[model samples]
Target chain A: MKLKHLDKLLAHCHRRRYTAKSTIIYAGDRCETLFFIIKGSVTILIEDDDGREMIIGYLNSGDFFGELGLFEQERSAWVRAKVECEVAEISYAKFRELSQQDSEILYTLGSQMADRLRKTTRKVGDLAFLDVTGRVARTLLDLCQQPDAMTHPDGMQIKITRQEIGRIVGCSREMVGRVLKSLEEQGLVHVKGKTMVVFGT
Target chain B: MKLKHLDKLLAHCHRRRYTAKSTIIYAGDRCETLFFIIKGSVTILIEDDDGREMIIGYLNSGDFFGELGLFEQERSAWVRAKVECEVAEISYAKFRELSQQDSEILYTLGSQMADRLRKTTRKVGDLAFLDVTGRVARTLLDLCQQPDAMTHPDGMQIKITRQEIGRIVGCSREMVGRVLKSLEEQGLVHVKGKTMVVFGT
Candidate 1:
């Protein structure tokens, strides 16, 4: 959604920055402000006490986070900067008042949230309905669609580690390595260093 | 979440009645309206060509659905009446105009969607992170928390068929049956007729 018309609200927003590897929001913490990414990306995930993590997804520039907190008392997931990141923050109270004057802000958030809700719901379905290999395939297909995915003549490539992929796909790193090797033998994908290349076949 | 302030918007909404086993919305259909359940229950799900279905969740009275359509051109999931259901629907154009007048309607949908989003994300985690038996146990535990679970001295009882439970848990009916039998033998639960009773003891 275009934020061009929300000159007042945008001007009112306070900007902040975070270094890479920094936690932007902690799970179970009380949240009262909404964040809009101005630059860079961040990972949204849930983690267990053992430090095992399950990634929900990522948000980048033009995308918003922390809106979920407006509806709930505490953060259900954690957000950590995927790279050096910049964001604009606005208290829910100020947002509510400003949104009334300019419904574009409201519509922008609503539209994006609806889009995200669909994506997340489908992830839930995929997790429930797919086996390990199926999940690996689904996660690759999803990763292949990322904005940063590099184009290769064979297909597309995503820069990621097996352990990172395992966290996103909810499997062990060893299992991910095994699956990638099997897929390599099947001529569907190739793993080189930290990049995974998917073939159309 | 109160609708009392949305007198104009609520009064403008058109109500519709659907019988049990009826399709309220079909997959891939273009959606221009949002729905609010006024009575009974409905199931939201996705199905494959072979007719195997994966249930997302259920929506009862006081819930709003079909908002997912507003953000996308076509419906991503199918909605059907689990029982006789009554719903109020308003065109997106009308909703947009009215919601500006009373942001409560917007916040109400936001709050419920956040809650549902959290539930769905966790379901995704449970499916990928848990085994079949764990899933059965989780599904039953969720069922046990339902508002309609029968009150028993020992614990709670949820009236459901094995296939229905399997559909929700994303497993084969036979597997659900086997798990229930094992749990029954272990004194964790008892399956009598169509009712599954959980014993805290």
Candidate 2:
């Protein structure tokens, strides 16, 4: 989290801005980069044979992506910019070079990779064990707990559509809407326009 | 797979033997080890809340277990020895020491770890993408391709029970039996007594 380290990393990174609606890396492409989001957001996408896109997760500003694809022979999933976005791409070659030179940076990045791996495993477990409602609650909790200024009472501003939630949670969009409405009725969350708020219970 | 590395690793390892119907590591116990099977076989057990035990996977001689749990703060699942088994247990401290000392060994292990992580990711994908029979066939292919074996083959000896296969494929025991029987009837495999064989198909 040091500014010095960030500056050093940025020195080797390529910065780009995109206004593409649904541009994504192909799933089978071999790519290596630590993508640091500067502005706007990106959605992680996976598609089935039927050509339906599922949103596994997303990366917002300050949160990076590409850690999951590090050791794989190919990209395990795809990613697309959801809005006008600015990102800094750290090439794999540079990443390996920096890691060899700086042990601290290596450890930091390694730990971050391990954490994300754990999150992915937990996500799989959630899909197996938890119902739609439980997953929605947990997802909201994760977004709320993130360090950001988008506070809504005890909740946080998650700027995604219900259909996106459905994709992430592996459920029908109608089911996601039903779960949200039920939670709102139960006072677990307050649905106001596009934002939802969760007050202290 | 080298004898020298195995001998060197075994120096810091404790060997344990278990007979059939024995449990190696319980579900919620404090587990610590990177286990390698010396001889015989073992099963990795995960159970539902209702106490239904599922054999997520199995390991034969030279196969490893407790891999994902090594870098974890907590053991995410349980492991058990399903049959007569001999295993080499590498303590976490020694493992970390080896990782720090030999970069090649660390890299080798990291590659294996990454592969396992990717497999878990793939399993999640399979759950969403494939039907039950497809999953079972894929599991068969995976087991046949185990590097621990002297040779990977569809006709390799597997000691897993119908119930175990059911657990691994996320289906009921009865369903697994029906599917296996169907495969046998279709001449894709031979269920000779308790053993199953698949070859030339």
TM-scores for all predictions: 0.91, 0.78
lDDT of each: 0.82, 0.67
DockQ of the candidate models in sequence: 0.57, 0.30
Worst 10 residues of 2 chain B by lDDT: B143-152
lDDT per residue for candidate 2 within B1-201, as digits (tens), equals: 356666777788999898876877765656577777888877665566866655555567766666555554666566666667888889877876765554434444444455555666676676656788887877766755654323326656544467767677777879878888787788776666656666652
RMSD of each: 2.5, 4.1
TM-score for model 1?
0.91
True contacts kept of each: 0.54, 0.13
Candidate 1 residue lDDT tens string, A24-130: 99999898998888889999888766688988898888887988878548887899998899888889888888777766777778777788778987787667667
- Tell me the lDDT of candidate 1: 0.82
Among residues 3 or more apart in sequence or in different chains, the pairs in candidate 2 whose N, CA or C atoms overlap within 3 Å are none
- Docking outcome class, model 2: acceptable
Interface RMSD (one decimal) of model 1: 1.9
